[PDB]
Amino acid sequence: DLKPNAATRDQLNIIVSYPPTKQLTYEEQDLVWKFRYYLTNQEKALTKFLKCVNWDLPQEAKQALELLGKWKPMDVEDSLELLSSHYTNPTVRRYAVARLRQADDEDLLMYLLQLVQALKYENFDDIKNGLEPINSAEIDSSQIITSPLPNLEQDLCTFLISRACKNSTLANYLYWYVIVECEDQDTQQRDPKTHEMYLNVMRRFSQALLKGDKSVRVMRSLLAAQQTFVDRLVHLMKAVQRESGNRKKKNERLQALLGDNEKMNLSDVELIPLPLEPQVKIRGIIPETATLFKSALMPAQLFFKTEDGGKYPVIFKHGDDLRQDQLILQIISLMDKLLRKENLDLKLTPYKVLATSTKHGFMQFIQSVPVAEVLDTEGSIQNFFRKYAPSENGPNGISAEVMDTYVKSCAGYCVITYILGVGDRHLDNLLLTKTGKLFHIDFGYILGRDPKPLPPPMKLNKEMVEGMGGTQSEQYQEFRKQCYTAFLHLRRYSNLILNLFSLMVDANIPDIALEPDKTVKKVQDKFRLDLSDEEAVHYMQSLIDESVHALFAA
Ligand SMILES: O=c1cc(N2CCOCC2)nc2n1CC[C@@H](C(F)(F)F)N2C[C@H](O)c1ccccc1
Ligand code: NA
Ligand code: NA
């Protein structure tokens, strides 16, 4: 093989270190191609090499595939890039699936939402041909599972179904994520072949479950029971939303219908996995504690009876698209897991969000109080903390543990909302727990979007700073430390985070759909990959200093 000199090797290392959005010039491509055999020893060089290939040229594609098979095994992040819209070559996509096969189900679950999006770039004929022995509108996606009839060998569809058949948690999310994709009216009208593909994925999944062993066949019946339960809940929600009168009158209708099990079948059901969190098995909804929230959207707070005698409160929305919130909460869940991997638990609240359609879905209810209500009832965050968690020896008369949780969650969310460009940040969408956990909700505005003009990049307020004990407190120093530490940890996983956002470009998420080609760059810019770790610390410190000076000047 051709060996490049020291100067060329250094030049190739700079190209290999380029950020994800960085496009290689034709001259850089010629250089990478010239030393393709040398670069085979570097797993990070593979994604740069594949950017040099014109997939419309059969021999160039063939040359690339031979090197792909000789290359040092790629990482999971790089396999996620090979499943994006950029790579439609079936063999390239098979190699990416071969890498995901080596990953644990725990990691696979973290990327499942994006892997379901990646099906849009798969071979639609291969997915259809996998079906064993009409107009798409005649196939109600919700009726597939409820109507059972009396190393490079696997594509993405075959792989996802195979793993789902062995894991009930994976099967739950695969079922619901595919149902939402089938229910996408924008996909149904603009790309009927994609809508047909998603129906075929569901039909393939139902077929594989029915061919499985005793536990696998039971999984199909449990998915059918969940679909039927959700269908019944949607019918109930429609009746409550149509009920003439005030919220009290709607609550009476809500409780009466939930209480009528012979008609609705919602309060007394056989043990079924909760769609929102399938590890939690439910007995039904408690009729007498179900109420609507004060909102024109009419969302309901529902308490589920768990198998172990517990109560699982949820928010169920009908007539709203939960997909943007679903993506943000799954990214927050991933960010929390990555921070925990680096041994940093910032006491975040990645509450569960699951769309059951593009029109309805669940949200895990965390017992908490919005900051606006905290000020109206107690006056301040510190007063709320002194009332529910007092300590004579603790900082400002508050439990040390509660204060530590507050500082950590403030810092965690400060860094996360900045990276995700979360807008519309007011005191009603900032929530607080009696354990000290501060968290964000309602992700209607992301990636720099805001209802007000000129939004600040850092989402800090006077109430947050006062809750810590001011700018001169030991808590404020801890907050700054946790901010730059969380920032450095997340920057290390920028390749992963960006590759997952790249898989969401065609997902019909409002704030992504607005500018799909600029989405990845918006997130990439927040990581400041142009700066070294030391420079990133000072940049994060500058963001905090500016935000604090600006908020106090009010
Ligand atoms: O997106 C979300 C997420 C969410 N979480 C609740 C805490 O656990 C995590 C999820 N709550 C809401 N929203 C949309 C706006 C309203 C809704 F849905 F009622 F309209 N609320 C309820 C309101 O904030 C509320 C009311 C009373 C107490 C606490 C909270
Ligand atoms: Na039908
Ligand atoms: Na947490």
* Nearest-angstrom CA–CA distance, 316 and 266: 14
* Nearest-angstrom CA–CA distance, 272 and 413: 34
The C-alpha angle 525, 504, 359, rounded to 5 degrees, equals: 125
For residue 379, the enclosing domain spans 368-554
Phi, psi of 452 (to 5 degrees): -90, 145
Beta strands in 32-189 (DSSP E): none
Contact 171, 223 (CB under 8 A): yes
The response to whether residue 431 sits with its C-beta less than 6 Å from ligand 1 reads yes
Kindly state the DSSP code that residue 138 receives in the 8-state scheme.
G
Both 372 and 518 in one domain: the answer is: yes
Q: How far apart are the first and last CA of the chain?
A: 65
CA distances (Å), 335 to each of 70, 319, 325, 510, in order? 33, 29, 15, 22
Give the domain-ending residue among 169, 186, 213: 213
Extract the tokens encoding 140.
Answer: 């109600």
* Nearest-angstrom CA–CA distance, 415 and 317: 29
The data reach a resolution, in angstroms, of 1.9
* Nearest-angstrom CA–CA distance, 423 and 446: 6
- Domain holding 36: CATH number? 1.25.40.70
CA 365 to chain centre: 17
Both 231 and 200 in one domain: the answer is: no
Other beta carbons within 10 angstroms of residue 328's beta carbon come to 24
- Domain holding 511: CATH number? 1.10.1070.11
Q: Which residue in 316, 324, 296 sits closest to 360, CA to CA?
A: 316
Extract the tokens encoding 74.
Answer: 């790629």
Both 493 and 540 in one domain: the answer is: yes
CA distances (Å), 12 to each of 63, 88, 239, 492, in order? 20, 26, 64, 21
CA 98 to chain centre: 23
Both 360 and 410 in one domain: the answer is: no
Question: Can you tell me whether residue 35 is helix, strand or coil?
Answer: coil
Extract the tokens encoding 33.
Answer: 């191609």
Residue nearest to atom 2 of ligand 1 (CA): 442
Q: Which residue in 493, 490, 343 sits closest to 416, CA to CA?
A: 490
Ligand 1 centre from 294 Cα, in Å? Answer: 10
- Domain holding 303: CATH number? 3.30.1010.10
The response to whether residue 368 sits with its C-beta less than 6 Å from ligand 1 reads yes
Q: After which residues is the chain broken (C to N over 2.5 A)?
A: 133, 150
Strand arrangement of the beta sheet that strand 369-370 belongs to: 369-370, 430-432, 438-440
Question: Technique behind this structure?
Answer: X-ray
Ligand 2 centre from 182 Cα, in Å? Answer: 13
Both 135 and 193 in one domain: the answer is: yes
Both 413 and 400 in one domain: the answer is: yes
Residue 216 burial class via C-beta count within 10 angstroms: exposed 0-12, middle 13-18, buried 19 and up: middle
Extract the tokens encoding 394.
Answer: 């603790």
Which ligand has the minimum distance to the alpha carbon of residue 405?
3
**DSSP calls for 283-340:** EEE-GGG-EE-SSTT--EEEEEEETTS-EEEEEEEESS--HHHHHHHHHHHHHHHHHH
Phi, psi of 201 (to 5 degrees): -60, -45
* Nearest-angstrom CA–CA distance, 435 and 384: 11
Any bridge partners for residue 300, and if so which? Answer: 292, 316
User: What's the length of the chain?
Assistant: 554
Secondary structure string (H, E, C) spanning 460-500:
CCHHHHHHHCCCCCHHHHHHHHHHHHHHHHHHHCHHHHHHH
Kindly state the DSSP code that residue 84 receives in the 8-state scheme.
S
Number of H helices and number of E strands within the chain? 26, 10
Contact 116, 177 (CB under 8 A): yes
* Nearest-angstrom CA–CA distance, 286 and 259: 8
Which ligand has the minimum distance to the alpha carbon of residue 143?
2
Which ligand has the minimum distance to the alpha carbon of residue 348?
3
Residue nearest to atom 13 of ligand 1 (CA): 442
The C-alpha angle 266, 268, 269, rounded to 5 degrees, equals: 80
Give the domain-ending residue among 367, 387, 407: 367
The residue written with tokens 């301040």 in the block is 380
The response to whether residue 328 sits with its C-beta less than 6 Å from ligand 1 reads no
Both 464 and 535 in one domain: the answer is: yes
Give the domain-ending residue among 194, 213, 232: 213
Both 239 and 313 in one domain: the answer is: yes
CA distances (Å), 95 to each of 37, 59, 88, in order? 18, 18, 12
How many domains are there within the chain? 3
Residue nearest to atom 11 of ligand 1 (CA): 441
CA 462 to chain centre: 30
CA distances (Å), 325 to each of 296, 301, 335, 417, in order? 18, 17, 15, 13
Both 424 and 308 in one domain: the answer is: no
> Ligand 1, closest atom to CA 365?
8
Q: Which residue in 404, 408, 364, 368 sits closest to 384, CA to CA?
A: 368
Both 312 and 433 in one domain: the answer is: no
Contact 74, 46 (CB under 8 A): yes
Question: Can you tell me whether residue 369 is helix, strand or coil?
Answer: strand
Contacts 24+ apart (CB under 8 A), 293-302: 294/247, 298/237, 298/240, 298/241, 298/250, 300/237, 300/240, 300/254, 301/365
Both 337 and 385 in one domain: the answer is: no
Ligand 3 centre from 351 Cα, in Å? Answer: 9
Both 106 and 233 in one domain: the answer is: no
Q: Which residue in 245, 261, 263 sits closest to 305, CA to CA?
A: 261
> Ligand 1, closest atom to CA 317?
18
Contact 410, 464 (CB under 8 A): yes
**Residue of 315, 364, 426 to test ligand 1 pocket, by largest number of atoms within 8 Å of CB:** 315
**Residue of 323, 442, 445 to test ligand 1 pocket, by largest number of atoms within 8 Å of CB:** 442
Extract the tokens encoding 303.
Answer: 């308490």
Q: Which residues of 284-317 are buried (b: 16+ CB within 10 A; e: fewer)?
A: bbbbeebbbeeeeebbbebbbbeeeeeebbbbbb
* Nearest-angstrom CA–CA distance, 116 and 503: 9
**Residue of 247, 276, 293, 374 to test ligand 1 pocket, by largest number of atoms within 8 Å of CB:** 293
247 Cβ partners below 8 Å, 6+ apart?
292, 294
Contact 456, 550 (CB under 8 A): yes
